[PDB]
Design a protein around this ligand. Structure first.
Ligand code: CA
Ligand code: CA
Ligand code: CA
Ligand code: ZN
Length: 316
């Protein structure tokens, strides 16, 4: 909508207070004009028609519990925008400042979030398995990263290329969490998963096997569930990325860690310059090796670590 840029205040899903960029025209709308062509947050109103209504508020204060998921979806989209811009010189998901749109209160008790090809969508969870999924920055950045992948490598969402797609989202999701720097970790979705159980998460990058995901190629899932195991086999690549950043010895193979920034640089380069729709894990290794060579040189520690990490997970 046409209006003037204003600044509201509210609380997010975890009861934390934050400022949000809004637009004023009769009502205060969840419309951030300060980033690219804007960030727009909508209310799906417990239904499944998308996007629903541009979020409108009478007084520019967002402290109702109904408000909380919207506050977080909006705020975290802005953080993710800032990460891509400041860290990788990328303007929104398409690289040309495309508008970022999110819908919250999708369906009733919906325990998931997704990119639907055009926008992000977040359920409120059932209160048992999940609370409102936009409460997790790693979740928000995970979904927005799907948009990035779609516009770049375009990895097909099935089998090995699908697992790479998923891993990229977990990786950047985590890197965004580290960038905002509020109790970051290498787990996915801990902030919004199982309110009754402390210390767990949906998936682990440091130790995929904790939640029954493979951590080595020999353990790859080859069935047809989960689009041929896109959320399962991603564990193999998640583990590799973790090793590249943090180092360690895995099934007897040692990796010298090079840190999160270099990890981000190598994978961002692979994603935008080398990966294709049909890339398999082996092609990922080659893409990451070439990225590292471009950035740091053929004989660098960075190249050696990429190689070691892929070795550790049994990807040749
Ligand atoms: Ca209000
Ligand atoms: Ca996390
Ligand atoms: Ca929990
Ligand atoms: Zn995903």
């Amino acid at each position: 909508i046409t209006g003037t840029s204003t600044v509201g205040v509210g609380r997010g899903v975890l009861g934390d207070q934050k400022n949000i960029n809004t637009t004023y025209s009769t009502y205060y709308y969840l419309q951030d004009n300060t980033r690219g062509n804007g960030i727009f947050t909508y209310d799906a109103k417990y239904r499944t028609t998308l996007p629903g209504s541009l979020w409108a508020d009478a007084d520019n204060q967002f402290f109702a519990s109904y408000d909380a998921p919207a506050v977080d979806a909006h705020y975290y989209a802005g953080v993710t925008y800032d990460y891509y811009k400041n860290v990788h010189n990328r303007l929104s998901y398409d690289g040309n400042n495309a508008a970022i749109r999110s819908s919250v209160h999708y369906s009733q008790g919906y325990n998931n979030a997704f990119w639907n090809g055009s926008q992000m969508v977040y359920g409120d969870g059932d209160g048992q398995t999940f609370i409102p999924l936009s409460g997790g920055i790693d979740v928000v950045a995970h979904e927005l990263t799907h948009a990035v992948t779609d516009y770049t490598a375009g990895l097909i969402y099935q089998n090995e290329s699908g697992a790479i797609n998923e891993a990229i989202s977990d990786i950047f999701g985590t890197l965004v969490e580290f960038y905002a720097n509020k109790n970051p970790d290498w787990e996915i979705g801990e902030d919004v998963y199982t309110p009754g159980i402390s210390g767990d998460s949906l998936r682990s990058m440091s130790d995929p096997a904790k939640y029954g995901d493979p951590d080595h190629y020999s353990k790859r899932y080859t069935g047809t569930q989960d689009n041929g195991g896109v959320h399962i086999n991603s564990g193999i690549i998640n583990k590799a990325a973790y090793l590249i950043s943090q180092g360690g010895t895995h099934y007897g193979v040692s990796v010298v860690g090079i840190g999160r920034d270099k990890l981000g640089k190598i994978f961002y380069r692979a994603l935008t310059q080398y990966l294709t729709p049909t890339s398999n894990f082996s092609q990922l290794r080659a893409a990451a090796v070439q990225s590292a060579t471009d950035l740091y040189g053929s004989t660098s520690q960075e190249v050696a670590s990429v190689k070691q990490a892929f070795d550790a997970v049994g990807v040749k």
